[PDB]
Amino acid sequence: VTAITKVEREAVLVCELPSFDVTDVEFDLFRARESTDKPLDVAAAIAYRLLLGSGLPQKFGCSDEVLLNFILQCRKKYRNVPYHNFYHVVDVCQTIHTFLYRGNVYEKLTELECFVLLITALVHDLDHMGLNNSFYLKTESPLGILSSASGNTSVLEVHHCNLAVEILSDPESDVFDGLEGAERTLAFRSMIDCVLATDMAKHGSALEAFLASAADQSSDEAAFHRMTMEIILKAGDISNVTKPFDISRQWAMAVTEEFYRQGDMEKERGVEVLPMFDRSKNMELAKGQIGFIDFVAAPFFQKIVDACLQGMQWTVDRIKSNRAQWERVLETR
């Protein structure tokens, strides 16, 4: 794990993001990427500013330099894939910032927890190859075999956690080095728990757990906190449909392409290709986005908002508005 150079730090620090408010729910990462010929540095700068602007690293003894090293170490481990790249995790970081601070979810968590969530966003898809857990298992790839053998089906999530722990073990990039005892432990545990909860195989049960805790005035507090963290990283991870329509559409395109490439590699390898992943089948984003909205994102956001996260109402409003817009694309086709 090579250390970060002063030269690499400078390339981030020079980016100024004129005309961008990284704290805004309408912030546009795609327009930020286009704004320079160095989209990676700009994305790094966005994460840096989000973290410093929270006031949180300072409070837990994370210097400016260690924070930036950490960001750049994370960045080196994302690949050039259409969706699960560095821009996605910067997007999730930014989105989480909005849920905490514009949606007032910060009130439900300690400052450490807020800090951990922003950091965890940047590690939560480390080294993704554009292939989902299912691909590794169906193809009996080495990682799939290892996951089956060890009893943990969350092939990618365990891999992400491993690389996170790797980055944090170097003090130069240990954003948690200012912590000790129970706090350091809670930081690592909560980071790891959150990443493991982003496996969509566990979606229904994570949601049901959170909701049951939020309705229970005698829920154990520590447990409620943990679940709140998990639900917020999950929320960022499926937040593409809570964004302004053109931003939501660009995300859907990126993910769709990545799914299609997975289906291409499955074909070639003679394994089962699901309809969603199959180029030869679809010809329509609209129906896909509406289906994802109806079956996954709208019930999720409505339920967490109603249970507990009142300040995030806008998410439910934008889903509804985006869905109506996709219905217009159908109605006029």
Ligand SMILES: COc1ccc(C2=NN(C(C)C)C(=O)[C@@H]3CC=CC[C@H]23)cc1-c1ccc(C(=O)NCC(N)=O)cc1
């Ligand atoms: C912006 O849209 C999405 C946003 C997120 C996802 C995800 N969906 N899933 C599903 C298994 C639930 C993942 O696990 C991904 C990894 C972890 C978190 C959520 C991600 C999928 C879509 C999505 C992709 C394709 C379709 C679809 O039906 N497209 C087919 C087509 N139109 O060609 C629908 C939703």
Ligand SMILES: [Mg+2]
């Ligand atoms: Mg993931």
Ligand SMILES: [Zn+2]
């Ligand atoms: Zn993700």
